[PDB]
């Protein structure tokens, strides 16, 4: 497996999963989100003001589905 680590741009949508996130600050970039199991879950979008980073691949941030199709 691998980590995404993408740092978000100003105005960029970010996605948490209300079902799987360990904390509400755990998020995925749109590419990882759309490649993840969480696209079928109760997701929550927060817009980045510039900064923050994608937690795809962080096995401590997600109760299930820590990776997306791209990073698995």
């Amino acid at each position: 497996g691998s980590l995404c680590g993408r740092v978000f741009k100003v105005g960029e949508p970010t996605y948490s999963c209300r079902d799987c996130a360990v904390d509400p600050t755990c998020v995925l970039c749109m590419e990882c989100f759309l490649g993840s199991i969480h696209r079928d879950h109760r997701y929550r979008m927060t817009t980045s003001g510039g900064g923050g980073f994608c937690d795809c691949g962080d096995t401590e941030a997600w109760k299930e589905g820590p990776y997306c199709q791209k990073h698995e």
Partner: peptide, 4 residues
């Protein structure tokens, strides 16, 4: 992670 992100923080508003």
């Amino acid at each position: 992670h992100i923080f508003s």
